[PDB]
């Protein structure tokens, strides 16, 4: 039948991340679960001066048509190459990944529930929400640990890009979410419930 | 052990109508607890003081009473809840029974403010809705269903019920585990609670 298609949303380093990908595991081979921030339009050919000032907080920076043809071929039954985005290097890497069809899909990414098509897709729409202080932190620890930026560059891009974004563009798609996940890295009864309710809706796509 | 599951939000932010939405799906497998109907008996004190009592700070609900039915239907036993009557400012002298259930749900304004009561719930909730449009809906029903003046439900919102929703209740949201929106009119969260309810049924 149809998957069962969740939508999670939330600033930077709010949880999302991490709640997707233990739902995910919670549920095993039955899910396939496609990362917007890896999605970002290829700039491989303009130079690094130019993909440094890049807004990657704005819907524009995103390659929405690719994102959403994807999600597309996996309602449809069929795999995908999945890009990868190297945040190091500040582009599209060469690599990609393949993501097998499912009958659970997850769409996880800070705007995720920004497009009315992307919305359209969803049968549960769940925003991930924190504090910006505490969002901040984890934000400028995993930039700092994993993607080679400095800690002055992170409060640059911070208080320039992310946070203007985060307030015009990503906490306005909360009014869209049925159900607001505080704590969402470390949240055992937040998750037991949305893997209940995809448990449930798995079981009606067997049963007749 | 039944399931336990406290919902928690402002005034008027529909948590009252997800409580009794989720009661009406999961039938009698439900038994609801609302805890304005366990102000503290206060037909001793003069009609003017009684209108003064602040109804928004914790001490003003007979909570050792709560307490002991939510423990007495947790042991699969009856209770004889008291009915408070909102024109009259009193506790009514006639109760109602609430049969046990293998779910059970505490819902009020504060009831994740005690910890003896968190300590109960299986399941926390708060449902989120600003204080504009909260207060609209609170000045509504005060003055079509309990007998206040417009000019009142301004003095006791601002005196009182703003204050301590900003002082007790809305802090309490951060022991939830999940928030719901539109409380009133959600069925995906109102499909997704019963979901668990059933399962944990199931067990
Ligand atoms: N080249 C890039 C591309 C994206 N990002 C950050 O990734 C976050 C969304 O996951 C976004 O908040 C965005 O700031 C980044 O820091 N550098
Ligand atoms: N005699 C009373 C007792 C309670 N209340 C209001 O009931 C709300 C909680 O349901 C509380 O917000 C409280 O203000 C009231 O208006 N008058």
Sequence with gaps: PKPFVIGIAGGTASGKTTLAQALARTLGERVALLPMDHYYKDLGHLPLEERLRVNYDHPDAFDLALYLEHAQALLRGLPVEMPVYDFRAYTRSPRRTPVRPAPVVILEGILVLYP????????????????????????????????????????????????????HFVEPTKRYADVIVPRGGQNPVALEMLAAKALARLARMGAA
């Design 116 to 167: 009315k098509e992307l919305r359209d897709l969803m049968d549960l729409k769940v925003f991930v929400d924190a504090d910006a202080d505490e969002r901040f932190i984890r934000r400028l620890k995993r930039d700092v640990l994993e993607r080679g930026r400095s800690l002055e560059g992170v409060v640059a891009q911070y208080l320039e890009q992310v946070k203007p974004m985060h307030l």
